[PDB]
Amino acid sequence: CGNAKINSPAPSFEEVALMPNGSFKKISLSSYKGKWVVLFFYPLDFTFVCPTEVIAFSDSVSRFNELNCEVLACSIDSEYAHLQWTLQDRKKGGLGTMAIPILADKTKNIARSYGVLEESQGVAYRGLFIIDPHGMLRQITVNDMPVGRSVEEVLRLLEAFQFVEKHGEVCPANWKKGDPGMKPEPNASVEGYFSK
Amino acid sequence: SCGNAKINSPAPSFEEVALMPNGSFKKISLSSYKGKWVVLFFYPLDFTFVCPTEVIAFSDSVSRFNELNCEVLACSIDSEYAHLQWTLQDRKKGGLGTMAIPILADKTKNIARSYGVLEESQGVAYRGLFIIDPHGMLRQITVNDMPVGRSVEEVLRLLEAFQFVEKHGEVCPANWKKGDPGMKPEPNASVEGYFSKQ
Amino acid sequence: SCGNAKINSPAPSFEEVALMPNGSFKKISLSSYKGKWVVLFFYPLDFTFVCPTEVIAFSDSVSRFNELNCEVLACSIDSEYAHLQWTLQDRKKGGLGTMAIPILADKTKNIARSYGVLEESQGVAYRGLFIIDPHGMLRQITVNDMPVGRSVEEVLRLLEAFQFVEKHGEVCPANWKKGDPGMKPEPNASVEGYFSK
Amino acid sequence: SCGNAKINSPAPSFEEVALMPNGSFKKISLSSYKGKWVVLFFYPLDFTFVCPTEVIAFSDSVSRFNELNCEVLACSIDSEYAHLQWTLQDRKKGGLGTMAIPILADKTKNIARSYGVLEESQGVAYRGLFIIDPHGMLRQITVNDMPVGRSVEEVLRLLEAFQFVEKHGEVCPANWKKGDPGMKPEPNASVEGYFSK
Amino acid sequence: SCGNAKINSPAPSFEEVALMPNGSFKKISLSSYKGKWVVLFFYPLDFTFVCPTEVIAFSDSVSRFNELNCEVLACSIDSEYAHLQWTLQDRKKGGLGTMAIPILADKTKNIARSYGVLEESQGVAYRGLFIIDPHGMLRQITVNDMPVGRSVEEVLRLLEAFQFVEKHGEVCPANWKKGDPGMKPEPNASVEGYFSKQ
Amino acid sequence: SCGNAKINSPAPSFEEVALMPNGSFKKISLSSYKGKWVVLFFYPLDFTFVCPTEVIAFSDSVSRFNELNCEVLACSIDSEYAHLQWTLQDRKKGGLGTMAIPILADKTKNIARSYGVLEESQGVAYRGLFIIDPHGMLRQITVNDMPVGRSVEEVLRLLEAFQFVEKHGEVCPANWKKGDPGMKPEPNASVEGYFSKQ
Amino acid sequence: CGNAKINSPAPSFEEVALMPNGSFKKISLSSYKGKWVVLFFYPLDFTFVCPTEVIAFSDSVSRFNELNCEVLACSIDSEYAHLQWTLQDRKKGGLGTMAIPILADKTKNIARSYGVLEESQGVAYRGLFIIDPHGMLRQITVNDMPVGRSVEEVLRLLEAFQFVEKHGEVCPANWKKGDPGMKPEPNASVEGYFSK
Amino acid sequence: SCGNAKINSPAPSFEEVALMPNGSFKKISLSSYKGKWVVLFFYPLDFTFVCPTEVIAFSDSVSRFNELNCEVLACSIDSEYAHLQWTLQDRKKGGLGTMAIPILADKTKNIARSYGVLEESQGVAYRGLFIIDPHGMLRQITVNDMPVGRSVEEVLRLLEAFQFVEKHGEVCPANWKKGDPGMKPEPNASVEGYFSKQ
Amino acid sequence: SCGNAKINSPAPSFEEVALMPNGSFKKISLSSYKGKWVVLFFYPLDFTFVCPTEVIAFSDSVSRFNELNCEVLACSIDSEYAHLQWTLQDRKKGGLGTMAIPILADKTKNIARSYGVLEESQGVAYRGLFIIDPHGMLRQITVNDMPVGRSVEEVLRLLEAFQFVEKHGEVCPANWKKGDPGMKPEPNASVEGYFSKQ
Amino acid sequence: SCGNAKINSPAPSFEEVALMPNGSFKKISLSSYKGKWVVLFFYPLDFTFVCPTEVIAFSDSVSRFNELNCEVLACSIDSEYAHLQWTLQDRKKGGLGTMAIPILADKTKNIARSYGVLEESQGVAYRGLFIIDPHGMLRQITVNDMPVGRSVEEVLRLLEAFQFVEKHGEVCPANWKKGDPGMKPEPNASVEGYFSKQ
Ligand SMILES: [Cl-]
Ligand SMILES: [Cl-]
Ligand SMILES: [Cl-]
Ligand SMILES: [Cl-]
Ligand SMILES: [Cl-]
Ligand SMILES: [Cl-]
Ligand SMILES: [Cl-]
Ligand SMILES: [Cl-]
């Protein structure tokens, strides 16, 4: 998916971001080594599905932070666009106060590198990436423009990947916190999981 | 994009042998799904761990996809003879048992390459799932690492969101489910119809 | 040349979505201006500092350009949705308010690229302004660094000069303004009519 | 960009023979101006029509540029021998008379090439003018078609604006002139200090 | 030559996961066989028809190889998990049963490619078999189309002819069999010792 | 593949002077054999050691190939003039005597090159033997190192197996000889008719 | 010599020239088919040897015209430069009234094509070319900057080439009008010329 | 420029066999003329028509060149043996007779190519004459078509003009001859010293 | 091959000025000799040493060639004017005198190049000689280094052997001489007719 | 030049198995001959027609070459094993019998290719003979078409001429044989000592 490959280092970047406090700051991906990161792109500030998603992630950021996971949004719009978007009322299609940084991918190269840039329109698809504390890409989700993502699904996936790293077990279809795992071995899988 | 799968381009086509649910072998083409939605999903290896849980999960729920005019198709790099034997193996011994969906045998691995979910060092497909519409256009991409399974309920959610989008000319907000209101993607209308009603 | 923009060559063409003065969205192509003078100006970013003063200044003066068979057209890399919000924001608060000129949304940035005014590392246009004739030929280039705005008066002087040149087959000396005489561009007549006086 | 001339990149360097104000011939290189603002202007041809009025206008005003730590430097594809004769010819007869600025003799035309103002089929420079800072960085581009001269006043406005920007860390709105206030280029301070007033 | 496999050149090297005789997975490399002869043999697909009969034949005959300082190694493009399940299936049901030889799982197909026996259109190996000597040099190539199985007797016949050659510095005539004389590969000695003695 | 010789593709084509059984020289084309099975076998050098014993063995068994609608064709890089002298030479003096098969004179070496069996260092062919069907399609490859002879009986076993295949639409297991059962290559019919009787 | 080769078509050109009457006019080389042409380059208007040569050729143009031969000067300077040069007094280093056209090779491509452009200075060497009525180059003369050409020599050469075309004879070293020719044949050369 | 001869670049160098005036053969190098002026002139063919008139003309006047520190060197594509024979041939029979200058034998034609005066369709040098100064820099180029000879008196004129230029730092006007005044190449000085004195 | 000159290929074609036997200049082309044999022979330089002796030898022997339907043609890189002067020089003074054969003047050297006999470092031809048959095909190549002349007797010997070959469809043994028998180029006829008859 | 064989450059190098006069096989290198003149001659095919008569003629005259410090070396594309059989074959049956010179077995054909004498269509050498001096420098090239034999006497004449050249610093005119005068290659001395006596 662009240069973004599962079990490869997530494409690095360093770019100006609108921060929670309203200020501008260069954020790099490497600066998150040690934590999980949910990087989500959306197409355009001031539009339709985009506000719902950004607000949803920002409002639920604590759910991610409790799990050693940071949240980053990104679009091709400027930091000044982002700022005004947060200064605009949610009832008017605005973001309001934000609890997550938003990158200004003004060169579009970040989205290009994640393979989610629609080149003819110059905007990102709804691509979301789960990156581990080693900097490794683990999960890709990309939606077409008119269909929003699911905060609940992304959290489910984060819990699963964490369960794997902690227990050296694998998570079956539909796993939620507290479901049993399976040992990825012929005999033990049958003994521990399949026979029940 | 993901291999040659780009959102809003035609889904890479293919014609490949599949294990049909009645146990026979049959060539399947992507083009033969025109007029319907298709959920195409890859998995790394027959006779392993998450893989059968996923194949069983979507097979067991296929009537739910088919009610929404959607077909399910599984795929891996294993042969049609391996698939067959997996379906003859009891679920309690890690098998598939009888299936209600086809399973492609991507022996050349080129279906998995064209979808951009092949792990070239090991020869196996990552957990890529692709939602394809009745015009054959790719609409959604899910790709999991090996040890973490997918979610049948999220695939149904996205399916209904896409069908709602195509019916009403509306868009679906974050976390949308069936019976939620959509939004008209116009500046004033979105405000008047959605953002203010919050 | 300035990218693909070369004086006395056709101005690079484009068809691109714009925020129309009435607040709708429409495709504008440069060839739709054939028959009229066009002033095209780029600016780096919506919701910034010198930029709004320039868009406001040209919008507010459009009739002075329309008087002279010249259209005015703004452009930046921002989307048409950003432009819309910027026009719905109060001038006192840093917005444009309602506009009397369209503004291109150069989302792929290829328009600024073709005009040679893209700061690539920033992905934003420098302050480029192009005077284009009824025949779609480029006649004047003006590019400013980011912190210094353009001059509406200067652009109007340039516009009247070009139009005087085309009408009278004469040339306009340094500092020319409307009312001033021109020079006939011939060795003898320039001395008699201009230099000796 | 404009040839190799890109805003906020170093102005393309050159070392080239010039007709010095005293009427001698000397090599001038652009790096010899480091520490000063430089206005470089090209013009098509000695012994023509708009050209002498522009060279005369900038020469005659040089002190106003020198006041502001800015040198002025003219350039055309003509030789230093043509420039010499042009200065020995009477202003009334179409000459420059004595000059207070140097004039480059860009005989290989590579200077105008590097500035992107060469009309190749004619082998002459369009009317390009470049404002370059003390650090040798390009800050402003102005190119006119052949029959329309530049404006000394406008160039001086641009020069004072740039210098104000560097001194005060502020930006200059559209139409700014000396005396006017600037804007602090920050979201809050721009509203309070400028937009609301 | 046969892909990269050239007679009297080092046989294409590899290091790959194998199903071992005890049903574990272990990375095997060809270089670890230096000092012994090796019969490497490919087959198209687990769970098919000629294939089990050859894997079983070479397994059952493994000691006849080991007596002659020769190891045996089977290979298909199938996963090591498919190999396992195949060893768990009854021979009377077309399974392998317990094996006395390792089976490589050439999941990238690059082993079969390096030996020039991949059918690219289907992604499976022809019935290629290679006799490699204690130095790692390829000595013999046998490749059968899919529907025709190989001969274990012939492979042992060749192994012994080669070992005869290496021992006595002589050559083996057509149809040479254990016990038969060879001939000195010299004009005069071939006539006096061999040709004139029929 | 083996140079340009690939299983289930057309055997590389050739047209070359051969020494005919009757002692004459004659151009022979491979395509002139369509309709018939062909066994084409290379040897490195006239007047050597393993070579005559192989040419002689194939020639002396020619009628058993002819009975199975199969021609036999020998080839080396030697001239047709050298081939004739060899047939004029006594078998007891390491000659061929009069032959019952033609011998190609592959003077350019392009035939052997096209079949992947040329040792370029010495400019002679390895012991490559190729089984080509009535359609011109290569079905089997056998390549031996210089010091070890091929097996006439093994070649006959292979022809009979392939002919059996094409006649009955069954496959030939490991070690199959004439009169052994074949197996239907289908999952159930292979178990019913073959595996269950093991 | 550049693209200029003896017995090849002289490199064609069409370029603005200062004419005898003081006007500007595009002149092409083809427009001289039927006449001889002496094309001479010089480096720079307003300089030293250059005036002497241009004046010498212009003053003696009738000598060329009597012989079906036109004269053309060329330099890299503009037509406006040329004009002012003719408006300047000969006593002051000027050309004065001119009886020949002067090309303005402002792109320098004409000199480039005659292989006489000194690229580092962007000016022509003192190259002179004799072209026949068929458009064929017949004679090349190139002087370094500080040494002027000879009008008398060029006329000598023109008379020689004309004698050749008229009589089918060749002109020996140092031939002047009315010197005998030689037939370019072994026997006749000895009989007619060498034996005397 | 003319081949590799450019005015104000070093004259292309060479070392070639020449017929010396005493009738011997000797290698000559351009570099061996350093410190002197050289007039190098090519001619198309020995035993022809204008050619000997030119060679004789410069040989007969060589003392005039040598008084001004200038050497004369002729050249053509003919061999040193042809040159020799031409000098043994009486002038009244079209010969050279004894010469007072060397004649290079440019047998490879590469001297004539490097000077850019070779007529490639016929293999012979055009009438190119080159004036070279004591630093080895090319200062003048004369090139005539075949049927029109050069002028020894013009070559002397140019020679003296160049030597005057180097002595006085002046330039030489159109038609300049010995004893004419030169001009200082400075704006005021040229006027005060020359243009006004006319 | 020898430059472009390959035995049994058309000899490099040319059309060039020659000095004719009557001392005129005429353009000669090789194609104008179709129907006859041609001996083309190169030599390095007019006015030298071995060269006249060979030109004279072939000239004096020209009728022996013409008797056998063979023309003779000499060639050097010298001009046709050098050739003329050489024919005007006395043989007792190392001249040619009157010639009975034409001499090409290969002034571009391209004839000698096409025949692969140019010495590039000196621009002269080695003593190359070519026997071309009535069809324009090259049959024989002889090339001598500069100090060693050719043999006319040997050239005639070869001409006759070739004409014998063409007439009788036989081959000429080593040292074959006019009058000698040839041999039928066939295994049986060569023995019965020739080898067994010494 | 003749492939890579050019006059006055080193004869292309080689190292190849040869059949030695004593009947043994031995690698022979050209460089092993420095110090000696060498005559290297190719023929197309063992067991043919002109070929044996040439090999025999050179072998039977070997001692006359040896006396002039010259070795003789024959070569064909045939194997050393074919060469031996040919020497074991009776001269009256078209054989060579025992030989007094070595015969190279140029099995790769690179020797003949490097000498420019390979007919690529048939893969055999033309009748190329090369005279190589004690420095390894090629001095003479002789190439005949297949049907015409070379001349032993002509080759001896050439050696003697070259040896004469190198001894006395004179050149050998057309038709020169031992005891004929040479000529000093200088204009006057050639006239004085040679031409004047004609
Ligand atoms: Cl836990
Ligand atoms: Cl609905
Ligand atoms: Cl008006
Ligand atoms: Cl101030
Ligand atoms: Cl049967
Ligand atoms: Cl006359
Ligand atoms: Cl003096
Ligand atoms: Cl002696």
Residue numbers in the entry:
A (entry chain D), G (entry chain D): 3 to 198
B (entry chain C), E (entry chain B), F (entry chain A), H (entry chain C), I (entry chain B), J (entry chain A): 2 to 199
C (entry chain E), D (entry chain E): 2 to 198
Task: Give the original sentences from the paper that presented this experimental model.
T(SH)2 participates in crucial thiol-disulfide exchange reactions and serves as electron donor in the reduction of hydrogen peroxide to water catalyzed by the tryparedoxin/tryparedoxin peroxidase couple (TXN/TXNPx). Leishmania major TXNPx (LmTXNPx) is an obligate homodimer whose active site is formed by the N-proximal peroxidatic cysteine (Cp) from one subunit and a C-proximal resolving cysteine from the two-fold symmetry related subunit (Cr′)89. In the first reaction, oxidized TXNPx binds TXN, which reduces the inter-subunit disulfide bridge (Cp–Cr′) and, thereafter, is reduced by T(SH)2.
In this paper, we report the X-ray crystal structure of LmTXNPx in FF conformation at high resolution. Optimal structure superimposition between LmTXNPx-FF and LmTXNPx-LU highlights that conformational changes occur just in two regions: the 43–53 loop containing Cp (Cys52) and the C-terminal tail (residues 169–199) containing Cr′ (Cys173′). In LmTXNPx-FF Cp is part of the first turn of an α-helix, located in a narrow solvent-accessible pocket that constitutes the active site. Cp is hydrogen bonded to the highly conserved Thr49 and Arg128 residues, both of which are essential for catalysis. The C-terminal tail (residues 169–199), which is missing in LmTXNPx-LU, is completely visible in LmTXNPx-FF, thus revealing the complete active site structure of the protein. The entrance to this active site cavity is covered by the short C-terminal α-helix (residues 187–195), which protects Cr′ from over-oxidation. Reduced LmTXNPx-FF is ready to exert its catalytic function, i.e., reduction of hydrogen peroxide to water, involving oxidation of Cp to sulphenic acid.
